[PDB]
Design a protein around this ligand. Structure first.
Ligand code: 860
Ligand code: 860
Lengths: 306, 306
């Protein structure tokens, strides 16, 4: 029993991290096969970041301007191109530790593990969720740019996030591995606004099911509710509206606990209106939305990977 | 900026996990050099666990009774011995992926990463703390026995914990890598009581310093206090007493924030007496004690490892 914010094992990703240097700037890159992926603003100086013309800047760079180190093994850049907001440095040596991998663009509310890196070397691993406003609430210092987010599906590493910037508000923004930002952000040092952040309701419900699995049942209500009446309460409290697809996803958790999804929603409705009154659920005094229904099934059933 | 419950990268440990089978029982083992370490109750059946005589049980087992698999590579057991509560299975093949490692016995209040495993295969990684009553509040299912806790000190993996059992109360107990239990527990299926659990005060203070580093300063008091007057308040609320060694450890955090340790204690005193009044600190509505002063310095300065 028990429940923890659990990350994926990072071994397969550690052997793909390299440091990329272009002039004075050094950040992390992802070395898969004979291509190194990294944020394109590595070609910028501190002055260029206020209003960078990436095409013009990249023209003044040639293959020998980029320095890729994989520990004490230096790679030679043989070609370079710009795909959206990432640079693709084609190198001579293919990574011998390349795992079976895939590039994926996740949807808001999904979770993934982050391997925070500095100078190409891993520092730590943690789990987080893509917020509905396409930011993440991470833990990043200067030089962490190019650190990647990922999931593991059996033997396959699914890369879904590359870190690019910290907003003036202290939250974090990045791209998929094809260089398309999550959200409306641009890789430029200017004031940028993230939308209103909401709570991922389907995740909160999954977490309440995890609490029931672990013996925390005090919030279980003697009432029920309707999908429309719940959504009317949820939207007052800045919660994501619940759809039928969400009910379908929670089905397995309903069957294991014998508690119908709508009855769980009624318990959530009371928690929203009356608070938690100094009590706790699974050790927390707040409603938690960083666990997807699949995360809960994974942890409470013991799924492993290669 | 930002702050997350961050685990160590697990790659060095993943290549050491193997599955150990003795008769019907299968659990995880740790393969370092030509020795496999695992909980000794792998030699028990479900009936033996109520009152096991481990010496008599081990006598009825020979080297060929143990089946060690490292993926699809079967190891041959050439010798076996019992060191306290762990079994040491000497095998023919030395682990080629053996990292520079060390066996350490941590003290209560220290933190470490857990690589939860099933059938010798990693499932996930999370960070936790050794409680003052020598339990851990983990996330473990049946068959996770033999999963290890560890820290990384540059290139050296420091193994400090091997998981053995879940108590009837739902918390977890285990040994160091020499087989000595943390706490007063025995590897037997009987009702066992853990002591009163207290809060690790030096950790709570480190976390408040992390909050100040990250812009959360509302709890900062216009008062001060004495070490004795604080300890008198802390012991009422089941907090560990603060000593001068704790003040010395927090010194670097004091210098970076310009807030003296005793002034921070005064802020903590008010939080204990008046609660948090629906507010939050670093995203939490409770005082957090699973971050050591070194954890905070590591995360807020960006320490990396090989
Ligand atoms: O924000 C940047 C650089 C940048 C600036 C503007 C635009 C773009 Cl694209 C990138 N780096 C950082 C990323 N994470 C965390 C950081 C913490 C402290 C300082 C910088 C941090
Ligand atoms: O508790 C045991 C076996 C055991 C029993 C008595 C004494 C000893 Cl030494 C070991 N296994 C488990 C360890 N962690 C988590 C578990 C979750 C569910 C079931 C068993 C779990």
């Amino acid at each position: 029993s028990g429940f923890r914010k659990m990350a994926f094992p990072s071994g397969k990703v550690e052997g793909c991290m390299v440091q990329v240097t272009c002039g004075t700037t050094t950040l992390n890159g992802l070395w898969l096969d004979d291509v190194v992926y990294c944020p394109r603003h590595v070609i910028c100086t501190s002055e260029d970041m206020l209003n960078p013309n990436y095409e013009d800047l990249l023209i003044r760079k040639s293959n020998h301007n980029f320095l890729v180190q994989a520990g004490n093994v230096q790679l030679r850049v043989i070609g370079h191109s710009m795909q959206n907001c990432v640079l693709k440095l084609k190198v001579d040596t293919a990574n011998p530790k390349t795992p079976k991998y895939k590039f994926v663009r996740i949807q808001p509310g999904q979770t993934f593990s982050v391997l925070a890196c500095y100078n190409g070397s891993p520092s730590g691993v943690y789990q987080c969720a893509m917020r509905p406003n396409f930011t993440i609430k991470g833990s990043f210092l200067n030089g962490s740019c190019g650190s990647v987010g990922f999931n593991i599906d059996y033997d396959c590493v699914s890369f879904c996030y590359m870190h690019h910037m910290e907003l003036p508000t202290g939250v974090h923004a990045g791209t998929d591995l094809e260089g398309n930002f999550y959200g409306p952000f641009v890789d430029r040092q200017t004031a940028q606004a993230a939308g209103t952040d909401t709570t991922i309701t389907v995740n909160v419900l999954a977490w309440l099911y995890a609490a029931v699995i672990n013996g925390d049942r005090w919030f279980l209500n003697r009432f029920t509710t309707t999908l429309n009446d719940f959504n009317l309460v949820a939207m007052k409290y800045n919660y994501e509206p619940l759809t039928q697809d969400h009910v379908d996803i929670l089905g397995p958790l309903s069957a294991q606990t014998g508690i119908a999804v709508l009855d769980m929603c009624a318990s959530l409705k009371e928690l929203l209106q009356n608070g938690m009154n100094g009590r706790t659920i699974l050790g927390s005094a707040l409603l938690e939305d960083e666990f997807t229904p699949f995360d809960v099934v994974r942890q409470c059933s013991g799924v492993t990977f290669q």
